[PDB]
């Protein structure tokens, strides 16, 4: 049958123009005052999935 997309991956990742995968950063949810502003600003940015994990993320999204 048809391949099924993982429901959690399709709410956490996105594709870019050249094929890289967009992602958010962790450690940004609730324990915030003790962290530095530089740390929090770096964590607020979007990032890309690492090369060693692209295969697993693509399998989760059905090679998308």
């Amino acid at each position: 049958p048809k391949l099924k997309t993982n429901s959690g991956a399709k709410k956490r990742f996105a594709l870019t123009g050249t094929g890289k995968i967009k992602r958010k950063h962790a450690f940004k949810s609730h324990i915030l005052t003790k962290k530095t502003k530089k740390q929090k600003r770096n964590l607020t940015y979007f990032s890309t999935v690492h090369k060693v994990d692209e295969n697993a993320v693509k399998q989760l999204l059905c090679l998308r």
Partner: protein
């Protein structure tokens, strides 16, 4: 000529066949290694599994929302308008754009500014970028949003 058919070189290839002796280099363990989960019949990969450590599709948060009234425009750039007109035209329109296979029938068109539109044209599109509209009007054209 059915007695002398031949396919192109390198077009057909024999399939791999495992577990049929030592000379093939694929017998015995038949490419599976020695023991463990991966050697058994019926093993399949658990796609998100990482051995028990919290997987990447769980360590990371969800983000965003999808708008149920989103509007998307098919981008038709400036250099296409001058190319199509000269090839085939001095008044471009959606029904003409569809007739030349450049856009589907039920699709909305916005004109952008990637190129030059030197030829003087009257243009009927659903949407126009600020720079794209100025490019036509400067080149002695007309812009009709409809």
């Amino acid at each position: 000529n059915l007695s002398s058919l031949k396919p192109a070189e390198g077009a057909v290839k024999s399939r791999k066949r495992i577990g049929r002796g030592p000379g093939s280099g694929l017998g015995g363990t038949s490419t599976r290694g020695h023991k463990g989960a991966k050697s058994r019949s019926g093993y399949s990969k658990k796609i998100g599994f990482e051995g028990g450590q919290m997987p990447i599709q769980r360590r990371l948060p969800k983000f965003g929302f999808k708008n149920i009234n989103r509007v998307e425009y098919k981008p038709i750039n400036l250099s296409v308008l001058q190319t199509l007109s000269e090839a085939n035209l001095t008044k471009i329109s959606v029904e003409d754009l569809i007739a030349a296979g450049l856009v589907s029938r039920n699709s909305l068109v916005k004109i952008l500014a990637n190129g030059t539109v030197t030829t003087a044209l009257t243009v009927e599109a659903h949407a126009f970028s600020k720079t794209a509209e100025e490019a036509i009007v400067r080149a002695g054209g007309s812009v009709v949003k409809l």
